[PDB]
Amino acid sequence: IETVPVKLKPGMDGPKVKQWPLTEEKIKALVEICTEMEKEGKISKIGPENPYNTPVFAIKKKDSTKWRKLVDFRELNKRTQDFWEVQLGIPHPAGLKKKKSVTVLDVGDAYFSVPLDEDFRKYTAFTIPSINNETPGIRYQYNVLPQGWKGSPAIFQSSMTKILEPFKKQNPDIVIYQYMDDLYVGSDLEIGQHRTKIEELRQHLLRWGLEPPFLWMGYELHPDKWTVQPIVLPEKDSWTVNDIQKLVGKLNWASQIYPGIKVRQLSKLLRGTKALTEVIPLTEEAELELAENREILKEPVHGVYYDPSKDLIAEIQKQGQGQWTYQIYQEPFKNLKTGKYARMRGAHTNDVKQLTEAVQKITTESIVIWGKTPKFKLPIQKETWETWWTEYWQATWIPEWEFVNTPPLVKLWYQ
């Protein structure tokens, strides 16, 4: 009810980010949403003395027909002061990734109940463009904590902890973790029980609220089943020259991750200049080397540790037939997590939809495990990604990304 003072970082001006082109249907949806938000006092029209801007668009959350305004506050979030005044931080709960069921709630509508510092509001400015720029873009700023801004969970955090106290005291084994506009709620209960507790939780916020348009939804995750991708070598009775070449290449690559990998005795099998399809019998020495390599590869990688002061990096490879592999790391060759997807939903003829869904699933895993989003290295041309990703986006946050333009040789080894 009273505003928390908020500043940008020293020597740092507000965002001035161009609005990208919006479709007719997203413009109409935003006009309708913003007319209502303005009537409810959440946003107000601004004049030309405000030169700041952040892009806006609109999405449909997973499994619903109603539009959700999404403001891309990535630049504002970079430029906003860090929030360590009351707490140095919310030490990320390491138990969340061990629960059998984790449900994700959109609680962002709660933020609209807290006014935003009068002197900071100018920096939340956004524009609803018009088709063909035929009428001036509609200019607004926020009067209340916005969805998507990193300050909102921080400023609302004292109110959230109070709202949730009776639920936590009654359910002490439940892990509740807040990331931006999401609440993550993990339990080890039978899913029918689980769903009921989640509905219990919603009521605490409905009760306090007295409506949230997307609070009723539930994205269910089962992180205890999440799968990883160790390095595995083929088991064959007949090895061709080509097979052994590919094995030596994969082992050479692995030797940068794992020290004691040896290829000497496997190379020796190719002595001469042989046809690629010719079958080569493994000698005993080569078989032993190969078994010793198999054994090395069953052990964890040495010296792998998470540092919360460093970015997480996520790399993705397209493997074909709807399959995608990925790795998350901070230092080269020190993977914190690897994985593979194939269940790309409703995208069997659309690579770019499949990649957008992969980015979202990886980001979710990163939030659950470390409590922040990775920086993505995406195998796509920038112009293709930028034209299409917002058509498939269903999350209320947005990570950072860069583009890979040269084909990585390592795609072969994650196959």
Partner 1 sequence: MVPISPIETVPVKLKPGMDGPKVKQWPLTEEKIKALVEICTEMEKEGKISKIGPENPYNTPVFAIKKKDSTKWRKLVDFRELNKRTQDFWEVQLGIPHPAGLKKKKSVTVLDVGDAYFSVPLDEDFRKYTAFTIPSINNETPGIRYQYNVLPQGWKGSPAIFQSSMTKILEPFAAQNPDIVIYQYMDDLYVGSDLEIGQHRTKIEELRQHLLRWGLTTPDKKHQKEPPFLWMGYELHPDKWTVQPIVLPEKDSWTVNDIQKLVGKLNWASQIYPGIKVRQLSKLLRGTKALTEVIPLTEEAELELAENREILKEPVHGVYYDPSKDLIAEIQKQGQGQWTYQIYQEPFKNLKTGKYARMRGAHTNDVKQLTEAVQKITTESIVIWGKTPKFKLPIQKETWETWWTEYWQATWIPEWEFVNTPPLVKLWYQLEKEPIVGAETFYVDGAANRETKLGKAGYVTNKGRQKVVPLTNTTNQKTELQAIYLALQDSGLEVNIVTDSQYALGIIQAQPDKSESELVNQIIEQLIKKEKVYLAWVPAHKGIGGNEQVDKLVSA
Choose the stretch contacting ligand FMQ; rule: CB under 6 A; options: 133-141, 226-234, 240-248, 385-393. Answer: 385-393
Our CB check for partner 1 shows the closer of 137 and 212 to be: 137
Residue 245 binds partner 1 (CB under 8 A):
yes
Residue 333 binds partner 1 (CB under 8 A):
no
**Which two three-digit tokens encode residue 400?**
């950072």
CB of 260 to partner 1, least distance (A): 16
CB of 19 to partner 1, least distance (A): 9
For 154, half-sphere exposure in the C-beta direction (CA atoms, 13 angstrom radius) is 20
Residue 379 binds partner 1 (CB under 8 A):
yes
Residue 27 binds partner 1 (CB under 8 A):
yes
CA 342, 343, 344, 348 dihedral sign is: positive
72 known member of a binding site: no
CA distance 412 to 414: 6
| 400-403/375-378 β-pairing | parallel
> 382-392 vs 351-370: helix axis angle to the nearest 10?
70
CB of 380 to ligand FMQ, least distance (A): 12
Our CB check for ligand FMQ shows the closer of 36 and 386 to be: 386
63 known member of a binding site: no
Which residues make beta-bridge pairs with 102?
186, 221
What stretch of H or E contains 392? helix 382-392
For tokens 């992180």, name the residue.
Answer: 223
Our CB check for ligand FMQ shows the closer of 132 and 277 to be: 132
**CB-count burial class (<10 Å; 0-12, 13-18, 19+) for 170:** exposed
Our CB check for ligand FMQ shows the closer of 317 and 390 to be: 390
Q: CA-based angle 401:402:407, to the nearest 5?
A: 130
Residue 387 binds partner 1 (CB under 8 A):
yes
Q: Which of 127, 327, 335, 390 binds ligand FMQ (CB under 6 A)?
A: 390
Q: Choosing among partner 1, ligand FMQ, none, which partner's interface includes residue 390 (Cβ < 5 to 8 Å by kind)? A: ligand FMQ
Q: Choosing among partner 1, ligand FMQ, none, which partner's interface includes residue 229 (Cβ < 5 to 8 Å by kind)? A: none
| 175-179/182-187 β-pairing | antiparallel
Residue 415 binds partner 1 (CB under 8 A):
no
Query: Taking a C-beta distance cutoff of 8 angstroms, is the pair 18, 53 a contact?
Result: yes
Among residues 106, 139, 108, which one has the least CA distance to residue 121?
A: 139
Q: CA-based angle 109:112:116, to the nearest 5?
A: 145
Binding stretches for partner 1 (CB under 8 A): 21-25, 27, 47-51, 53, 129, 131-137, 139, 240-242, 245-246, 248-249, 252, 263-264, 267-268, 270-278, 318, 320, 350-355, 378-381, 383-384, 387-388, 404, 406-407, 409, 411
Which residues are documented as binding site? Answer: 106, 181-182
Binding stretches for ligand FMQ (CB under 6 A): 20-21, 386-387, 390
Which residues are documented as binding site for Mg(2+)? Answer: 106, 181-182
